[PDB]
Amino acid sequence: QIQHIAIVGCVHGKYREMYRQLSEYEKSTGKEISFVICTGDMQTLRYEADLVYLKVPPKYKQMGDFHLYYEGKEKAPYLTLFIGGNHESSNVLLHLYNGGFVCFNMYYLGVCSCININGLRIVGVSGIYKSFDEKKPYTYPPSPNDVVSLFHTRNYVIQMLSNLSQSSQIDISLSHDWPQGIVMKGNYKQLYRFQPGFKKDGASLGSPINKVILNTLKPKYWISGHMHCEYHAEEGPTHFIALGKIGYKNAISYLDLPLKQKTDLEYDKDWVCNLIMTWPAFSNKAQFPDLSYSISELLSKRTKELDKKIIELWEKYIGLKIIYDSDTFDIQFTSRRFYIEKIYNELNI
Numbered sequence: 001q002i003q004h005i006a007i008v009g010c011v012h013g014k015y016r017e018m019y020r021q022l023s024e025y026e027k028s029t030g031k032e033i034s035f036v037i038c039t040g041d042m043q044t045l046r047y048e049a050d051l052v053y054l055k056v057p058p059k060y061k062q063m064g065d066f067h068l069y070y071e072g073k074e075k076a077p078y079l080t081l082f083i084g085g086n087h088e089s090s091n092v093l094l095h096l097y098n099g100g101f102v103c104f105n106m107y108y109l110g111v112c113s114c115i116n117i118n119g120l121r122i123v124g125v126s127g128i129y130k131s132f133d134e135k136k137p138y139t140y141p142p143s144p145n146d147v148v149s150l151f152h153t154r155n156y157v158i159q160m161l162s163n164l165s166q167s168s169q170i171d172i173s174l175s176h177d178w179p180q181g182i183v184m185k186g187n188y189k190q191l192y193r194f195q196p197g198f199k200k201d202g203a204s205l206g207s208p209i210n211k212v213i214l215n216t217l218k219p220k221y222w223i224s225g226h227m228h229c230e231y232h233a234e235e236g237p238t239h240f241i242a243l244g245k246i247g248y249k250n251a252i253s254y255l256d257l258p259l260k261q262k263t264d265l266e267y268d269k270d271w272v273c274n275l276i277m278t279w280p281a282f283s284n285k286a287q288f289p290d291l292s293y294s295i296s297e298l299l300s301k302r303t304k305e306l307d308k309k310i311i312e313l314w315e316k317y318i319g320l321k322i323i324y325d326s327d328t329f330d331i332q333f334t335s336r337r338f339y340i341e342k343i344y345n346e347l348n349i
């Protein structure tokens, strides 16, 4: 029994084209797509106003396809999971920094998180790396002055994710830019022939943040977009797979994985516990996280019995199933934070 997972690189707002290719696959092969994974540049612009939050050169200030799906005119034929890249409606993604559905069948994993589906554990890390913004907090509500910095990956995600492989392995990890140095771990001479511009960066190509996370969790698969090319590499037990850009034939590939249990999309318990236990660092809605707190120190307080109570409370107020919520994203921001705070304060500390 096997499941077929579509892995997609850069979408850049070409949703109808993406879903067509996926459909062409299910007919070319007669195989069923279980769900879709996307590695960023989703450009989930709801309406014209969101263009302000899209960091692109002027000629790429375009609405794209997403609003069609936001409006219900079009409907995603598959459950689609994604992280953010460097070309996003960053205001929308900041509202949903704790993850959320942007529309039917399209789930954003947030700044970072781990989810559960079909017996698999999947980790996502949004954004691209810029050293000068790695320690920068998020400011809320979103502001047009931060269009150039909202999509930069923060250092703290490392401490947020580092313990996730303690109780079970990670099957798939997602990032937009490549883990730094992994370019040297495939046929890089061949890669440079197709992509001569990459040779200059050498082993420094990619995100040092994703490099750390990969080395720490050692997932079965690490999948990345950003670089506009197909590429495979092996870092120890980890299969690295880079994907291209929609419109070109290197953008989509497929994972054929053993299917033990068919199971709806669910929150990962270990992630949920980290989420609750780090609440003090995220308590200021105007500016988070406050790094006068040590994320590691906060997470060190997790215990078997506390985790059990947390998951019990999460199931009660939110549910383990990740379900579609059609409330505006500003409402979802406040709502999810309300329950995280409620649960933390119920533990007693």
Ligand SMILES: Nc1nc2c(ncn2[C@@H]2O[C@H](COP(=O)(O)O)[C@@H](O)[C@H]2O)c(=O)[nH]1
Binding pocket: 010, 041, 086, 087, 197, 198, 199, 200, 201, 205, 206, 226, 227, 228
């Ligand atoms: N040499 C080099 N090129 C990069 C690097 N990061 C991004 N690029 C180039 O910039 C493009 C970014 O595409 P976009 O993010 O606009 O979809 C990549 O496809 C790649 O050609 C990098 O670190 N080094």
Ligand SMILES: [Mn+2]
Binding pocket: 010, 041, 085, 086, 087, 176, 225, 226, 227
């Ligand atoms: Mn990109």
